[PDB]
Design a protein around this nucleic acid. Sequence first.
DNA 1: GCCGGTCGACCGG
DNA 2: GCCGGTCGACCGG
Lengths: 257, 256
Amino acid sequence: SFIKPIYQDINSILIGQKVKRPKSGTLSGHAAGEPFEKLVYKFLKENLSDLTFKQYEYLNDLFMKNPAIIGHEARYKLFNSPTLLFLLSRGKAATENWSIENLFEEKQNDTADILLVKDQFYELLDVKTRNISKSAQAPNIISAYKLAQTCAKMIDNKEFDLFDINYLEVDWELNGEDLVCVSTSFAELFKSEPSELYINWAAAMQIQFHVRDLDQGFNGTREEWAKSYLKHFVTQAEQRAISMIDKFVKPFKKYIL
Amino acid sequence: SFIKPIYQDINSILIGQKVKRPKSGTLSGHAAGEPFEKLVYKFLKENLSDLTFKQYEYLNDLFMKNPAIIGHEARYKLFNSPTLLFLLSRGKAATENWSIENLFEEKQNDTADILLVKDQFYELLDVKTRNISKSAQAPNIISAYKLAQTCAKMIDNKEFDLFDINYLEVDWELNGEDLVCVSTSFAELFKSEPSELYINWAAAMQIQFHVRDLDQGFNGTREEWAKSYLKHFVTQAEQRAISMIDKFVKPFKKYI
DNA sequence: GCCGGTCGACCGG
DNA sequence: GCCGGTCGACCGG
Ligand SMILES: [Ca+2]
Ligand SMILES: [Ca+2]
Ligand SMILES: [Ca+2]
Ligand code: NA
Ligand code: NA
């Protein structure tokens, strides 16, 4: 990680940073701590200025550093990596229409919140804000499906030393007429036991876990991670197939016969 | 519907309205046109003050005119309807610790945005916002599961005349800073063909469609709508179990 | 004390 | 038309 070494510099400037609350008055979903994510990034941009990039920010530069390139085919080859492309790309149309006049904007679908790149190594940073004023179910981490594919693309293309997926939990609470961070948590996806990783199918097939509680004792290799997770996914997919019928079918069959 | 009769009147007030954008970043999800639901409730309050209630505002009122009744037990009996309870009631410890000094607030998973009650009849209205500046996918209408549960309850209790679930789509487009409502659409769930409803399992098993495109020509009994929906629900469920395997199993089995 | 359901609203490598 | 993932972050009728 490119943040791990300065987690204390970050964690510190965070706790106690009174930030105005959303003018909307819902504090749910994106609006929840959206301003917080911005807060985190802004710091990196000033500390690790050379490695910090917003996912679209990276893209716009990537394309702009190669102006003599056009079309989707050519612009995709600029990733020099299938996996890393499947995680950061935009889509035929969006890619083909890119321009210095029609840049890329933040897309709700984007895999990573912030990108940290250096020495041909990428760190996909996804921050999760958590309202400490209450106790709720584990946040959405990432799509198990998009994770299963990323593993396939890793195994097939043999790319085990290219990127990392790390999370930064930002605990906040309501105080007065504005929000306030009260603590933080960091963890590395590829450092946790894959087999134990929880997949919430209904919840957009997302993996769910509080960063604060994520274990980090995986001693195996990266290749060993992918292959191990992909096995966990399938198993859970099968198990879910059955349970789905046992829960959304059986108890209702007495209304159609 | 207590809204329909004056749809044209609401549709005229909303068009033109504006809402300042948040942190000036990704106006999506709970942070998108969300604020427009606050304008629907407002105008609805001004023209139907005796029937407009935030689902929580309503519950706080119910309990407030029943000082004698305390405890989750009896407090639930205050709904006088299982189904509606499954759709409006709050948690156990929540209804227990309720006091005029600890009222209900906005819950993130509350079935409705607005509740229009009148003469023992309810209208669970769910407002939908949308940036028409782009051809986007259809929004989450409601949990297909929660719906199947609702119908099943409607048949166990014969409650085929008590509530209606309707939707109000409000389209907006960015204009400098604030977002300005440019259009509107209204539609009644229980009028659409319960069999042509699209269940997106990966998307919180939510029913998905754009209000402006929902068909309104069902010509059966409410009892029929339910029976049908459960037949359509149970079917799709089986089909999903099979689709999963061929999409999250076979293409990944080469890896072990 | 183990687990997963719901709301909001997004385009198509 | 039609089909369907994905990011965000929420507690118990
Ligand atoms: Ca995030
Ligand atoms: Ca709504
Ligand atoms: Ca299309
Ligand atoms: Na994520
Ligand atoms: Na809904």
